[PDB]
């Protein structure tokens, strides 16, 4: 299907006048908020709720240091706001920030048999925070083994009779927990559906959240326009008609990896790569021959525009565009002398191409590999090792030692890649199966373990579960690299959860899952 967006994003003229107005009041609101954080004499519950609100409002990136200092202090003090609500929240915020706070803070809320006291089933605010906390657990938090099921059943039971906006918050949470959602998406929901309708809302924070969100949206729109023109000038739409035209959906991903203004250059580099690798994918799937695909793979490994001759005219178009793109990246980074890092992204791309070729070889032979062998090849084809690597290109702070750590396939990255693989395999099984693609994950799983499609899917779900625990562990201090370089990997996993929510295929169908988000993040501004 052709792009549903049209030339809608092609042109965007920022009203510098309005943007300057927003920038100026935001700066003042920023300081008022800073002083709220630095206020002495606040109770623990009030301090935690303040930080939690600023994060959900999507403005916490302005106070990364003040929030860190406060959570550090709270971490170094340990306490018993003897209630579930404050305890679960404290646990969650500390864990999401890398502080390894003990899970035993939940002991006082469980019986002698390890299970949560059923007598808490009437504390909705406690159940909600426990619910959100249950999603940041690691392999060492067996104490929280039943937290999810427990809080879920009682939240479902209470939801219908709660007041608004709390009811909407509970219902949304049951459908999408905070820890695993895309930040801009959760922030947009919280601001206009929840906080804006909160009777006890803090008008200063709300004003701040709306203006900042809309101000950034202007930046996002500018970037997307810039990328749309770039995409239009390549004109693969008329040249390579077999390919998908989803530059908008590709941008959403880049936006999900990082939304901060300081990452503008990174987002633009990232979208172009996602967009570009998407064409290579379509070329291997619906268009090329074993001979064509073979020469394509080889040309890519050699990586020299002298190879453009050994390729069919249509593949010459893809190939040249790819080398030019990396040449542009090299050019873009000259200024800072960070052009030497481009090679890391290139090596990852070559890897994706190789496995794509193996993937098609498996399809042609009708091979159904054991899960073990399937993953050895299918993990890279998610393109995730490649996107994570690509996401660092525009991060002015990323060093050679940072890429070096990533090149070794750290557990956190591996976890994120596995999540994308198993979830995608579960959501796209039946469709790929109807295409004769018998080397699909669920199939390999079924044959390998000699189980049903249901049992296989359930197995992949456990792999995803295990993978999230690994990610949560990977965020704990001391981290192998700055948190700044872990967040992009976490966000990639989040994008997976959001794109295939309820096992709906949002990869093969944009209008089914992403359309709403794209409208709320890139079309409609939050009305003040
Ligand atoms: C806005 C965006 C980016 C939405 C979708 C993001 C998402 C998680 C893409 C999954 C990529 C997979 C794994 C494709 C193949 O490996 P295949 O076609 O073989 O399943
Ligand atoms: Mg493919
Ligand atoms: Mg698939
Ligand atoms: Mg496929």
Q: How far is the CA of 250 from the centre of ligand 3 (A)?
A: 17
Please, are residues 48 and 89 in contact by the beta-carbon 8 Å criterion? yes
Cβ neighbours for 337, distance < 8 A, ≥ 6 positions apart: none
Q: How far is the CA of 105 from the centre of ligand 1 (A)?
A: 39
State yes or no: 244 annotated in a binding site.
yes
Breaks in the chain after (C-N > 2.5 angstroms): none
Going by the DSSP 8-state scheme, the letter that residue 452 receives in this structure is: -
Q: How far is the CA of 424 from the centre of ligand 1 (A)?
A: 7
State the Cα–Cα distance between residues 46 and 56, nearest whole angstrom. 15
Going by the DSSP 8-state scheme, the letter that residue 305 receives in this structure is: G
Q: Which ligand is nearest to the CA of 427?
A: 3
Ligand 1 pocket mutation, candidates 382, 427, 435, 508, criterion most atoms within 8 A of CB: 382
Cβ neighbours for 247, distance < 8 A, ≥ 6 positions apart: 3, 227, 228, 231, 271, 275
Q: Which ligand is nearest to the CA of 441?
A: 3
- Cβ of 283 closer than 6 Å to ligand 1, yes or no, is no
User: Which residues are found with C-beta within 5 Å of the ion, ligand 2?
Assistant: 281, 284-285
- Cβ of 106 closer than 6 Å to ligand 1, yes or no, is no
Q: Is 349 left (phi over 0), alpha (psi -120 to 50) or beta?
A: alpha
Atom 13 (ligand 1) nearest CA: 382
This structure was determined by X-ray
From the alpha carbon of 513, which atom of ligand 1 is closest? 4
- Cβ of 285 closer than 6 Å to ligand 1, yes or no, is no
Atom 7 (ligand 1) nearest CA: 496
Range 157-166, long-range pairs (CB < 8 A, 24+ positions): 157/121, 158/124, 158/127, 162/124, 164/197, 165/193, 165/194, 165/195, 165/197, 165/198, 166/124
Resolution in A: 2.3
- Cβ of 420 closer than 6 Å to ligand 1, yes or no, is yes
Per the listing, tokens 């920030």 go with 97
Q: How far is the CA of 383 from the centre of ligand 1 (A)?
A: 8
DSSP, collapsed to helix, strand or coil, labels residue 116 as strand
- Cβ of 182 closer than 6 Å to ligand 1, yes or no, is no
Cβ neighbours for 450, distance < 8 A, ≥ 6 positions apart: none
Please, are residues 500 and 182 in contact by the beta-carbon 8 Å criterion? no
Q: How far is the CA of 387 from the centre of ligand 3 (A)?
A: 17
Please, are residues 396 and 333 in contact by the beta-carbon 8 Å criterion? no
- Closest CA relative to residue 75, chosen from 40, 102, 35, 107: 102
State yes or no: 15 annotated in a binding site.
no
Q: Which ligand is nearest to the CA of 355?
A: 2
Q: How far is the CA of 395 from the centre of ligand 2 (A)?
A: 28
State yes or no: 425 annotated in a binding site.
yes
Q: How far is the CA of 489 from the centre of ligand 1 (A)?
A: 15
| Domains of the chain in sequence order | 1-40+201-527 (1.10.600.10), 41-200 (1.50.10.130)
Q: How far is the CA of 318 from the centre of ligand 1 (A)?
A: 20
- Cβ of 424 closer than 6 Å to ligand 1, yes or no, is yes
Atom 5 (ligand 1) nearest CA: 507
R_g of the chain, CA atoms, integer Å: 24
**Length of the chain as a residue count:** 528
From the alpha carbon of 249, which atom of ligand 1 is closest? 1
> Angle of helix 124-134 relative to helix 147-158, nearest 10 degrees?
140
- Closest CA relative to residue 353, chosen from 277, 240, 291: 277
- Closest CA relative to residue 248, chosen from 256, 238, 240: 256
Atom 17 (ligand 1) nearest CA: 382
- Cβ of 116 closer than 6 Å to ligand 1, yes or no, is no
Going by the DSSP 8-state scheme, the letter that residue 194 receives in this structure is: I
State the Cα–Cα distance between residues 432 and 84, nearest whole angstrom. 45
State the Cα–Cα distance between residues 511 and 174, nearest whole angstrom. 22
Q: How far is the CA of 472 from the centre of ligand 4 (A)?
A: 29
- Cβ of 253 closer than 6 Å to ligand 1, yes or no, is yes
State yes or no: 281 annotated in a binding site.
yes
Burial class of residue 210 in the structure, from the number of CB atoms within 10 Å of its CB (0-12 exposed, 13-18 middle, 19+ buried) = buried
From the alpha carbon of 381, which atom of ligand 1 is closest? 16
State yes or no: 432 annotated in a binding site.
yes
Atom 20 (ligand 1) nearest CA: 424
- Cβ of 496 closer than 6 Å to ligand 1, yes or no, is yes
Q: How far is the CA of 282 from the centre of ligand 2 (A)?
A: 7
- Cβ of 428 closer than 6 Å to ligand 1, yes or no, is yes
From the alpha carbon of 359, which atom of ligand 1 is closest? 19
State the Cα–Cα distance between residues 85 and 435, nearest whole angstrom. 49
DSSP, collapsed to helix, strand or coil, labels residue 505 as coil
Q: Is 436 left (phi over 0), alpha (psi -120 to 50) or beta?
A: left
- Closest CA relative to residue 107, chosen from 124, 94, 88: 88
- Closest CA relative to residue 5, chosen from 234, 257, 221: 221
Per the listing, tokens 């219902």 go with 171
Please, are residues 206 and 196 in contact by the beta-carbon 8 Å criterion? yes
- Cβ of 514 closer than 6 Å to ligand 1, yes or no, is yes
């Amino acid at each position: 299907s052709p792009s549903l967006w049209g030339d809608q994003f092609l042109s965007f003229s920022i009203d510098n006048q309005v943007a300057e107005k927003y920038a100026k009041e935001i700066e003042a609101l920023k300081e008022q908020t800073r002083n709220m954080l630095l206020a002495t004499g606040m109770k623990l519950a009030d301090t935690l709720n303040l930080i939690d609100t600023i994060e959900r409002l999507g403005i916490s990136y302005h106070f990364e240091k003040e929030i860190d200092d406060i959570l550090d202090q709270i971490y170094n003090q340990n306490s018993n706001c003897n209630d579930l609500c404050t305890s679960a929240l404290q646990f969650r915020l500390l864990r999401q920030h890398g502080f390894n706070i003990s899970p035993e803070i939940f002991s006082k809320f469980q019986d002698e048999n390890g299970k949560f006291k059923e007598s808490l089933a009437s504390d909705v605010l406690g159940l909600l925070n426990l619910y959100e906390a249950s999603h940041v657990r690691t392999h060492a938090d067996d104490i929280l083994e039943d937290a999810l099921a427990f809080s879920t059943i009682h939240l479902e039971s209470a939801a219908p009779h709660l007041k608004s906006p709390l009811r909407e918050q509970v219902t949304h949470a049951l459908e999408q927990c905070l820890h695993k959602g895309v930040p801009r998406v959760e922030t947009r929901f919280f601001i206009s559906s929840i906080y804006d309708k909160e009777q006890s809302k803090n008008n200063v924070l709300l004003r701040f959240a709306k203006l900042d969100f809309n101000l950034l949206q202007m930046l996002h729109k500018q970037e997307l326009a810039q990328v749309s023109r770039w995409w239009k000038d390549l004109d693969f739409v008329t040249t390579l008609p077999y390919a998908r035209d989803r530059v908008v959906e590709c941008y959403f991903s880049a936006l999900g990896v990082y939304f901060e203004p300081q990452y503008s250059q990174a987002r633009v580099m990232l979208v172009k790569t996602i967009s570009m690798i998407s064409i290579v994918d379509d070329t291997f799937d619906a268009y090329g021959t074993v001979k064509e695909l073979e020469a394509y793979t080889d040309a890519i490994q050699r990586w020299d525009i002298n190879e453009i001759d050994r390729l069919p005219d249509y593949m010459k178009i893809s190939y040249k565009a790819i080398l030019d793109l990396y040449k542009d990246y090299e050019k873009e980074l000259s200024s800072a002398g960070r052009s030497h890092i481009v090679c890391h992204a290139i090596e990852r791309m070559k890897e994706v191409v190789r496995n794509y070729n193996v993937e098609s070889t498996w399809f042609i032979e009708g091979y159904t590999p054991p899960v073990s062998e399937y993953l050895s090849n299918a993990l890279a084809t998610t393109t995730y090792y490649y996107l994570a690597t690509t996401s660092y290109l525009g991060m002015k702070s990323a060093t050679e030692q940072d890429f070096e750590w990533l090149s070794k396939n750290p557990k956190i990255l591996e976890a994120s890649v596995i999540i994308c693989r198993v979830i995608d395999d579960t959501a796209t099984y039946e469709v790929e199966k109807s295409r004769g693609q018998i080397a699909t994950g669920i199939e390999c799983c079924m044959r390998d373990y000699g189980i049903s499609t249901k049992e296989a899917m359930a197995k992949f779900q456990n792999m995803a579960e295990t993978a999230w625990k690994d990610i949560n562990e990977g965020l704990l201090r001391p981290t192998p690299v700055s948190t700044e370089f872990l967040t992009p990997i976490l966000n990639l996993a989040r994008i997976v959860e959001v794109t295939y929510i309820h096992n709906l295929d949002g990869y093969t169908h944009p209008e089914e899952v992403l359309k709403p988000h794209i409208i709320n993040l890139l079309v409609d501004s939050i009305k003040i």
